[PDB]
Amino acid sequence: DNMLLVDDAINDDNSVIAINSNTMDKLELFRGDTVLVKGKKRKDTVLIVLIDDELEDGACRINRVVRNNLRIRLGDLVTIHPCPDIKYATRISVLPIADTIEGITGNLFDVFLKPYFVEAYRPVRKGDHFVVRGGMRQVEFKVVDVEPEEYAVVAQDTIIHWEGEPINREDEENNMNEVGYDDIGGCRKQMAQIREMVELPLRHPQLFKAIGIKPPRGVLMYGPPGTGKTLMARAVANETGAFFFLINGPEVMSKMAGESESNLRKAFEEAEKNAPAIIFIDEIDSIAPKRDKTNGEVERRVVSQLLTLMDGMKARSNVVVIAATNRPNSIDPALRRFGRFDREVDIGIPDATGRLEVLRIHTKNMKLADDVDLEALAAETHGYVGADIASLCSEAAMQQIREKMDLIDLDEDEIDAEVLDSLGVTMDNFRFALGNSNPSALRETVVESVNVTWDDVGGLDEIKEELKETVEYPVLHPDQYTKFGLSPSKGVLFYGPPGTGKTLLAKAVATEVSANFISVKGPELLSMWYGESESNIRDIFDKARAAAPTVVFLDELDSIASDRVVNQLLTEMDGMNAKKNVFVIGATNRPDQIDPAILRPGRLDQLIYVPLPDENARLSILNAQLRKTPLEPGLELTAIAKATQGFSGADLLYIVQRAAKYAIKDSIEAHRQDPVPYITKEHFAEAMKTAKRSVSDAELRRYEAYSQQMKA
Amino acid sequence: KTATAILRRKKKDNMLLVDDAINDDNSVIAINSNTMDKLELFRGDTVLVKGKKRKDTVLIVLIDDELEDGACRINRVVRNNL
Ligand SMILES: Nc1ncnc2c1ncn2[C@@H]1O[C@H](COP(=O)(O)OP(=O)(O)OP(=O)(O)O)[C@@H](O)[C@H]1O
Ligand SMILES: Nc1ncnc2c1ncn2[C@@H]1O[C@H](COP(=O)(O)OP(=O)(O)O)[C@@H](O)[C@H]1O
């Protein structure tokens, strides 16, 4: 409980902290000594304590400037420690800030030397910002350097130096060197995993010695481009507070031979010198790509040198290596063996909550208009990684500038601040920017989370129970299976008429067990077969393993029934270990062309027939579609359900869509000539008159015959 | 509609028109007294004239009531120079 609550202070003094005597009693502090207050992200300061009985016990009084310097807000908890090693300063060097001296010239250092340090003995520390009043201005300077270390106190005999040039303020902010856990959202699981795999070796190495194990060193995080890998690495490095050193694949690969090895050796040696340290790499694929395609000697020697350096790392050393790559399988396989990068992590596209958090983080400095509905943007935007969200915000701001430019004239070199005061980003700007966006992650197989429950599934209760017994029990009750000795099956294959609710079933299954759904359509398999596609099935299954538990989906599996892809799929699936929580769900409308090998035990052996929806199922599905669209009061869907015998979910959805389109057209005409913003009976009448069936009766008979044949 | 807002240039009273000069003066440009009155221009105070793609020059302003407001007295020499 030594931590104390941060409180707003009316006083503007930069070297006085007022606390109650009971606050000293808690730590048994003695009057007349400075105290060290440490906040977050390795931010600390030393303040002269005063007794103010007015303040209630546990309440402090620190000006806003000190809190801003510490990077903390009101109401935070800061650790307070005594100052047994209080020391005075012998030589301090400080420089001014040019933007803070605007409007007044001259040398105010001499003006501030005496009045501000007249036997004050104000404790000082590296990087502190202190504000002094000169003439008609209040100028803030920074503590460039102080001796003796580490913080010391500003004694009168201390020699003060001011020989140098002013340094910008926002330059430090944009350095990117200061980013904590707060600057990331939507990666709670991956962030926690990285923290566990990094902090423990560095913060508490004694655990591994106590338990008798060599702590892991090789951590490899991979994900879609522009997903925040570098930002997450920087954030964790700063939060740890250990020494940092970064290597860029493009940078190292851009220098002639020899120089690359020299740089790598120097980096490793320097990191070893200043342990604990973290070594980070970027685009490790570029320096160590797949050997099967790059036969050049330069990359061979570079990768060999990297391997030798990794192997030669001493047994006991607080150094952790982190690598980044878009393709998990692109890097040379030699790096993935034990004693090297083995702790693999996959980062997927953020879900709705992740998108909301990212948008909140980015939209923290722009002049957001009064009417903003970030929740709606999060709901609409799917498949957007953080980088695309930042681009969307930038484009919306650009559109706002387009709208507001008419007031000003661009020829003049100055813009009136009155216009600047009016700048604001409205919802329409975000809508337009979203309309002019271009997501790219979704075009490739990427792991994403789904949140579909059994409610969305319109019926098929028996299939629901069968699927539950098949999947959920081994995922949440493996003890029973181990006790009985029965291994869990993994190969499930749905077959039936198209548009009967298969993908939604797979999503629901993935949601129930809280697993990362993976989608792989038949065209993707065909492209992989022809080689045009980048990722291969091996990559898909490696990502599935790294993201376990997972549910992989194979749509139109008959579209590849080609034999090489089938053979590779069989090999990868059989190689999978059953104990791992990995499941494959195949779908096909023609369960006859599939090669017999796929149906062997230990593979896609479970066969599930998907029948057409029943009247109750049709009614439930229609209700599910009609959740946001207002309906004519008294509208009855039972007649529609009864008149739609043999229909499929897709056909019912299209019926709803055409009815909505007719209602919209009627509204347009009425408005041109919104009193009627909903649908009425006539639209449904037209829709049902324009009804049909996507499946012929012959196909239904064939499906029934095949299902009965499989039963017998 | 508005996407091309940047391209269009705002209008202002100080911009003027180009016409051939009756006189042969080179460094001296004459404008109507009303145009000076709108901008409160006086006699003896040199004028910075900016043309196209940053071309600029300094001329001597004179009172010429005869001329249409916003119409200038500049010959082929000054036109080439600008
Ligand atoms: N939570 C977040 N997740 C992802 N990107 C984020 C997040 N918050 C901000 N960003 C933005 O995303 C970019 C940071 O990710 P970055 O572009 O470094 O990822 P990357 O593609 O893994 O990088 P690298 O160049 O190292 O391969 C910056 O634009 C940052 O503003
Ligand atoms: N139980 C259900 N049976 C059939 N369709 C359903 C069911 N529940 C919902 N639907 C709807 O079926 C439509 C088609 O879903 P989709 O996954 O494309 O089907 P398929 O995988 O058969 O092509 C979706 O709009 C979905 O809302």
Where are the strands (E) in A183-299, listed by range? 218-222, 243-248, 277-282
Sheet holding A343-346, edge to edge: A243-248, A277-282, A319-325, A218-222, A343-346
H/E segment holding residue A643: helix A638-643
Reported residue count of chain A is 712
Looking at residue A182, the DSSP 8-state letter turns out to be: G
Q: 């546990």: which residue's tokens?
A: A58
Token code pair at residue B9: 């240039």
Query: Which ligand places an atom closest to the C-alpha of A225?
Result: 1
Distances (CA, A) of A411 to A101, A414, B9, B35, B54: 29, 9, 9, 22, 11
Question: CA-CA distance, A221 to A56, in Å (whole number)?
Answer: 49
Q: How far apart are CA B47 and CA B39, in angstroms?
A: 12
Q: What's the gap in Å between the CA of B5 and the closest CA on chain A?
A: 7
What's the CA gap between A44 and A140, in Å, rounded?
19
Query: Cα separations (Å) of A602 from A482, A487, A492, A599?
Result: 17, 10, 10, 9
Q: Are A518 and A447 in contact (CB under 8 A)?
A: yes
Angle (CA) A341 A342 A344, round 5°? 100
Q: For tokens 């019912």, name the residue.
A: A652
Residue with tokens 């070893």: A272
- In total, the C-beta contacts within 8 angstroms joining chain A to chain B are 16
Give the residue among A119, A107, A128, A108 at the shortest CA–CA distance from A154.
A119
CA-closest candidate to residue A643, choices A631, A625, A655: A655
Contact, A617 vs A625, CB < 8 A?
A: no
Q: How far is CA A487 from CA A509, A581, A602, in A?
A: 20, 12, 10
The minimum CA-CA distance between B3 and chain A, rounded to whole Å, is 7
Query: Assign residue A229 a region: left if phi > 0, alpha if psi is -120 to 50, beta otherwise?
Result: alpha
> CB within 8 A of A9, min separation 6: which ones?
A18, A60, A61, A62, A63, A64
A641: phi > 0 → left, psi -120 to 50 → alpha, else beta; which?
A: alpha
Task: Report the candidate in A199, A229, A201 with the shortest Cα–Cα distance to residue A313.
Answer: A201
Please tell me the distance between residue A588's alpha carbon and the centre of ligand 2 in angstroms: 14
Optimal mutation site among B6, B11, B56, interface A, most CBs of chain A within 10 A: B6
Distance A442 CA to ligand 2 centre (A): 21
Point out the ligand 2 atom lying closest to the alpha carbon of residue A610: 3
- Three-state helix/strand/coil letters over A649-682: HHHHHHHHHHHHHHHHHHHHHHHHCCCCCCECHH
Token pair for residue A212? 């008798």
Give the DSSP H or E segment for A625: helix A615-625
A45 half-sphere exposure, CB direction, 13 A CA radius: 26
Query: Residue A7: which of A58, A47, A69, A70 has the closest Cα?
Result: A58
Question: How many residues would you count in chain B?
Answer: 82
Q: Report whether A92 contacts A148 (CB < 8 A).
A: no
Neighbours of A662 (CB within 10 A): 19
Token digits for A20? 């109650």
CA gap A109, A134 in Å, rounded = 9
Q: How far apart are CA A18 and CA A27, in angstroms?
A: 15
Pocket of ligand 1 (CB under 6 A): A 184-186, 225-231, 282-283, 324, 358, 361, 386-387, 390
Mutate to test the pocket of ligand 1, among A179, A190, A231 (most ligand atoms within 8 A of CB): A231
DSSP classification of residue A368: B
- 3 state DSSP class of B58: strand
Sheet with strand A34-38: strands edge to edge: A3-5, A77-81, A34-38, A44-51, A16-19
Is A402–B3 a contact, with Cβ atoms under 8 angstroms apart? Answer: yes
Sort A7 into a burial class: Cβ within 10 Å, 0-12 / 13-18 / 19+. middle
How far apart are the C-alpha atoms of B36 and B62, rounded to whole Å? 9
Neighbouring residues of A611: CB distance < 8 A, sequence distance ≥ 6: A460, A496, A500
CA A409 to chain B, closest CA, distance in angstroms equals 6
Selection from A332, A342, A329 nearest residue A568 by Cα: A329
- Structure-determination technique: cryo-EM
Q: Which residue of A has its CA nearest to B12?
A: A409
- The partner residues of A78 in beta bridges, in order of sequence, read A4
Long-range contacts of B64-68 (CB under 8 A, 24+ apart): B64/B30, B64/B31, B64/B32, B64/B33, B65/B32, B65/B33, B65/B34, B66/B32, B67/B30, B67/B31, B67/B32, B68/B17, B68/B32
CA dist A362 and A360 (Å) reads 6
Minimum CA–CA partner of A409 in chain B: B10
The 3-class SS string of A559-571 reads HHCCCHHHHHHHH
Q: CA nearest A393: which of A384, A403, A405?
A: A384
The CA dihedral of A592, A595, A596, A602, to the nearest 10 degrees, is -120
